[PDB]
Design a protein around this ligand. Structure first.
Ligand SMILES: CC[C@H](C)[C@@H](NCc1c(COP(=O)(O)O)cnc(C)c1O)C(=O)O
Ligand SMILES: CC[C@H](C)[C@@H](NCc1c(COP(=O)(O)O)cnc(C)c1O)C(=O)O
Ligand SMILES: CC[C@H](C)[C@@H](NCc1c(COP(=O)(O)O)cnc(C)c1O)C(=O)O
Ligand SMILES: CC[C@H](C)[C@@H](NCc1c(COP(=O)(O)O)cnc(C)c1O)C(=O)O
Lengths: 444, 446, 444, 446
């Protein structure tokens, strides 16, 4: 069934470095539309990954395809780093405006979420005149040297490549699942905030910290959301010490959580700096750092620019992509379908006790599998068999951190397919319970 | 004059929203559409392109094979990240790049989006393969704007100011200047002198045996189209291999036929890099890059040490396959060599008549025409180069400057001889015009 | 009483940088002996600080004075960095032998605890081929760029001097007083070991960590001892991952804790690397890093040396200093006088509820002062009052961390004097409770 | 032969316990006692000290006033830390040092234990005062063995190997070499060439406006007794003062009369430092050091940014007070100046008869005699230098080498003319004896 796919992968493994791919299964995609992937052997699948939340508006949206094709006929590329073009001008202004909050904003383009997160460091340091950056354990911010240092989701992002960027301090992110007996959401918030302050009470001067960077919901961490009160404490801590408050919206923005921006899951928080990428241009490489105007004015050329950033085709694909999110009401749909999928997985959890935790905000969720509900011991083996059963039954899903099923379908996903995919996962759970699935390095 | 009104207005609006640090400004050129070496602005004016979007447009604007590849690919799959799964344009391209890279040792590839991220990877791969931390790169260099690649760079102080500390364990060395030499020095003197400067850190505080790699532009772009002497490069290459130091090259600006060979390092005798970076022209300006390295080196890391969600995007992969096909079947490597020897002669003739031209440097349709206040002092004359680019722009030619006083000559490799001759004549005219004070002219350039 | 002191201090202030002294009171010491200090105004005091535990054998001990005098007549200095002298030869050998545990050891001399801690970093990195160093929040390791990066007890050891040494990670030290309601010592041990592991489970590879450096009892932190269990877990974690286990015995060695080395308060822990200073030469500038032999052979000259380290006068003084420790049995005497002083402090806590915590291990202690025994809000104002009283009644004592009284008198302090000092401290509490004490920057 | 038995046994026992990286080895000299310029070993052999414990014994070994200050202070108080409290000998010295420092601008002082830690303080104070991060130091320099000062250094690869990453944001520049020059170069050509190298990092990746200080040895010690030319120093001093860069000097080795002025920076016209490190001879080899800077620089930090338990030890402080009085009362500064000019002639005369002497450098009783295999190639001759110090040791003279091939001449400043001439005759004989192959030889030296 995967004869061609397997032959092409075996060839690719001779020429394409293994560090450039987290492998799960032999899926070679030929074409796709909406939430449907078709492989080179003719197998069809429903996509519950959306190329890691880059395909929020669905694969090959008619509108995005046309913008791409039309723009490519006029100009494939002229660098905004030297000169200008219209899609770029129009996009940079539109992004300045749809970013959360009311303060005047400016924008700088990149190619990837990585480089936008490097930008956040640059802009925070330059505006504050301070050097230290605080970021979170469990985070993923990119694979360039700045954003990679801020990250804490894989040891292979640190092994053999150091020394890393200096003056970076990692603090732990609130885990509302593996908690101490009898802890409320209040306790968790306060205990993690207390851990947050320890470096500041010892070796890290708050008056020399340029900024704090946070995923309002951690993606690669395992779809973990900060509690409301935790986040308001951090936010407040930052404004009281003149530390910029920065958000990474690259994974969780553009409607993934059922609001436009995942920071809007929290009350009245306007970031000083934010990174955007992934779904921005429907998987075409474009990113943006968007900060308050006075922060963005603290650097002079050429501190931060890329030859191919704000590519006019990418830009056109992005304008059409933002229009699909508005015109098809994808933010609201994500909230709705997400509430629905939440209820469906909680019901499955009544019948499959390998499901320890159901986290979901919009059509973005982490379904954490454990060996026993009270030890909460991770059971990656179970998760791997679930995704293997899924793949063999027309559903593409992967894991985070070994034992968490990752749920991030295109937001356009028809209800019919959503229900088919959910039924396969229910079936998978039963199969794995029954010993009916068996199995190099898989996943994180 | 009264011909740039729409452009001026759109720019004044853009500047309210788009950070000033994101653009090196020259003139009010807003491109509407383009083809070949011809740009058409939003005001309907037409220009001959002598920049090729900073060497990203080697096959010319909107090549119909590249357009075609983009549109057809987009119809099937806009994206699926090769960081998790696979697609055919990316598989075919990675393989092809491993084979067409310089030399015969087997290679592997890792994709990025930018020349910046590929140079970050060179750091990664070198350190992991060698187990050593120090990186040596050059004064005058440009490697990118991510923290690794930006630290390696040495072409603008605005790439260091207010954003440090930068990446540790990097050392800069001077790049050979063959124009501003000491009186009497030969090419051999220059080579030896700059090799002696290369060795000074290694003879004091920098252990050769803890140095992972030396990264070098075979010809420096942002530095001002400066080529290392043959013998210099041989000594550095030799030194690297006597010490277990990887020899790495940046072919982002000067690869893919720009110098009149496929790769800039092929201007030198029998140098095979361990690691190289590619970008820019790779996919005709679509965002795609690669680090190409020897197979053992590229095997030194495990995932996810280096990957990006949108790197090796299939639309960009398809555009790149089409771009590399065009380069071969249109013979762009050879055309760049032939037209370049021709451009060099035309500029040397111009230098006989216009004493402000201190140095003509050209390898392929890749040149730096360095302007100076006096042939003997060689004092840079930025003001004159700024004047020449303003004159050129006003007569339908788009050209910019490097390091203040150097005219950057990098037109698409497809440039028709008709247009190349029109553009060279306009520059000839510009020199005369500037001599006679006809041209007038906040921060322009580097 | 302090006419001459103040005129002298006033002049010094014009010429000696204020960063170079943590200020408490106008004490200008003219001479001393044992535990008795006499100022230039002829006032007399009892020494409860021992020059930050640098004078364990008491001031101007007759045998150390003689060593100094006699050596200075033969050779004031010849640098062992180029050549050799006998007092240095003899001391290095003796130090290699009296270090804890029985693995063969070698030694390098420095001038300060600070530089011995820089050496720990060098030797750990060199022996392991790894770069990362873990140290603790609340730690104090020194004032040279390496040791100072590792430290975690004053924001003024980081402010304005960065960037600091890279590849250093700080972890939380187990606080056995401000705990969560219900916690045993077992819970504390495991909670703080769980914090220890978090960086190694996110961004810090255990296999690239060269060493963990720990004060067995933290001094500048407030005389905080690590629980036995937490320490066995860290100790084990390092052996399992090839991380070197290193201890700082600069403040807490040489009998301060009632055993020879503070690490001997724990069961069967032989360190890979250790720093020594302070009391080693009676406050004469001398330090050593002592490591397992194979660790110390990982470097070639001149990786770690100083012109004036292992100065022969300093080495003579140290040899004599060590002999007094043995022949006056100060190790035993510290343990006895400390169990005694502990009960005297527990007694005072009965009558003075402002005493929230009594921590004592040998004649080494911290007496923590609070505003309430349940809130445990620190009362810095109280502790400043207590020490200002003590001073005005012939007792030299200082505060750690604002609110913690520091009890570290020379180990040879006579029982008569100890009781004299303790009674002044008793009077001090009552006087402060009755508002009978009134009082820029003081202490930490 | 048969004279070194006790020494050999002792060193052989020492090597089992004392780490090999703590000593640069030359020969089996184990000192029992010394006085003035006379060392006596444990075997009862006698020698003339031409090293002064690396310029730490300027006033001679066991000077009676220094020995007396040590004894007398020890009976009153061996230590009370100035980091917490005060004592009279530290107070007096802190003030004398602020006053005897070069230039008229008011100064403050902070005490350390070692020249290393004083250079670490230079880094901190410079960063703190300017609010800038970058430090510029020299290739060939030695500043110390603590992470800050060690990162500044550039005289041995074993100061960087296996212990990095080092301190970030440090840049090394080359120190002017007036011996191995290009044909025809005057001292003006050297000064300008080395300044042009100084400027290259500031013209590429290092913003002058983000550079906190330059740290320079006025005469390099471990680099081989190399003195910057006057004009090179003026250009650096100038450049610093035009950009808000602190100008900092290390006087640890070359201070306190060694050069035949009180401070080596006084060999230059009208240069006052912002910061200087002092150590070594300060307290006659007892562990004491100071950072001395302009008042306002020293006020840029709050406690405890820079302090040490045993810094400003009262015993070391009294030794230092006595040491400085001896320097003044015995006219040691002028004596180094006079005996220096005399020693220079002598060596210059030896050069005529022994052509292996390639270069004679001398400023005070402070010289490097550089041995080469040929006058025109200037190829280092380590072998010859090592043979000379072995001849020398055998005939009652203790001298060592710098950089392989450079004889280090740094006797106590109080050395009597008869001993000086005794030791100079031995060296004259050494040369001739090595020319005849009469001398035989782990790693020796640097
Ligand atoms: C290829 C997918 C990546 C391994 C990872 N996402 C990348 C990411 C990034 C980096 O984005 P790129 O540089 O575009 O990959 C930045 N911020 C967050 C919150 C991210 O999740 C993920 O979603 O698994
Ligand atoms: C926008 C253009 C850029 C400022 C500059 N070239 C970028 C470049 C880069 C960086 O490539 P990107 O990250 O794709 O901009 C890497 N290596 C070399 C040799 C380069 O020249 C240039 O050609 O001027
Ligand atoms: C001046 C005294 C110091 C501020 C401080 N102790 C210095 C110290 C040091 C540094 O020793 P020095 O470099 O000799 O000051 C190293 N390790 C520990 C555990 C230390 O406590 C103290 O005990 O308060
Ligand atoms: C032990 C002798 C040392 C290897 C070396 N000098 C130490 C030194 C130092 C360091 O002094 P300490 O840290 O006291 O050794 C600082 N600055 C200069 C210019 C120095 O020369 C020397 O003079 O050979």
């Amino acid at each position: 069934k995967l004869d061609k796919a397997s032959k092409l992968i075996d060839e690719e493994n001779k020429y394409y470095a293994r560090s450039a791919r987290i492998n799960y299964y032999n899926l070679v995609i030929d074409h796709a539309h909406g939430a449907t992937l078709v492989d080179v052997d003719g197998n069809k699948y429903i996509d519950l990954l959306a190329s890691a939340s880059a395909i929020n508006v669905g694969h090959t949206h008619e509108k995005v395809v046309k913008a791409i094709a039309d723009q490519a006929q006029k100009l494939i590329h002229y660098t905004p780093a030297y000169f200008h073009h219209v899609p770029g001008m129009e996009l940079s202004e539109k992004l300045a405006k749809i970013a959360p909050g009311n303060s005047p904003k400016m924008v700088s383009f990149g190619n990837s979420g990585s480089d936008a997160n490097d930008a956040i460091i640059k802009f925070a340091r330059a505006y504050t005149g301070r050097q230290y950056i605080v970021s979170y354990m469990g985070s993923y911010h990119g694979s360039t040297y700045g954003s990679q240092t801020l990250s804490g989701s894989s040891l292979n992002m640190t092994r053999k490549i150091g020394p890393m960027l200096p003056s970076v301090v990692h603090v732990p992110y609130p885990d509302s699942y593996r908690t101490y007996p009898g802890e409320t959401e209040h306790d968790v918030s306060l205990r993690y905030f207390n851990e947050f302050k320890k470096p500041f009470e010892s070796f890290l001067p708050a008056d020399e910290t340029a900024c704090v960077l946070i995923e309002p919901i951690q993606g690669d961490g395992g779809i973990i959301k900060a509690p409301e009160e935790y986040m308001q404490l951090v936010y407040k801590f930052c404004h009281e010490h003149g530390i910029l408050f920065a958000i990474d919206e690259v994974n969780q923005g553009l409607g993934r959580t059922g609001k436009m921006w995942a920071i809007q899951q929290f009350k009245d928080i306007e970031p000083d700096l934010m990174s955007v990428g992934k779904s921005l241009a429907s998987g075409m490489p474009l990113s943006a750092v968007i900060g308050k105007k006075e922060v963005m004015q603290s650097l002079d050329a050429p501190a931060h620019l890329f030859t191919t950033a704000g590519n006019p085709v990418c830009s056109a694909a992005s304008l059409a992509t933002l229009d699909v999110i508005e015109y098809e009401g994808l933010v609201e749909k994500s909230a709705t379908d997400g509430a629905y999928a939440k209820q469906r997985f909680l019901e499955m959890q009544q019948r499959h006790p390998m499901i320890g935790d159901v986290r979901m905000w919009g059509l973005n969720g982490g379904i954490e599998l454990v060996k026993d509900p009270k030890t909460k011991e991770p059971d990656s083996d179970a998760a791997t068999k679930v995704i293997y059963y899924a793949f063999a039954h027309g559903v593409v899903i992967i894991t985070l951190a070994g034992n968490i099923l990752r749920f991030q379908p295109p937001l356009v996903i028809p209800r019919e397919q959503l229900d088919q995919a959910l039924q396969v996962l229910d079936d998978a759970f039963t199969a794995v319970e029954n010993g009916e699935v068996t199995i190099g390095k898989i996943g994180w």
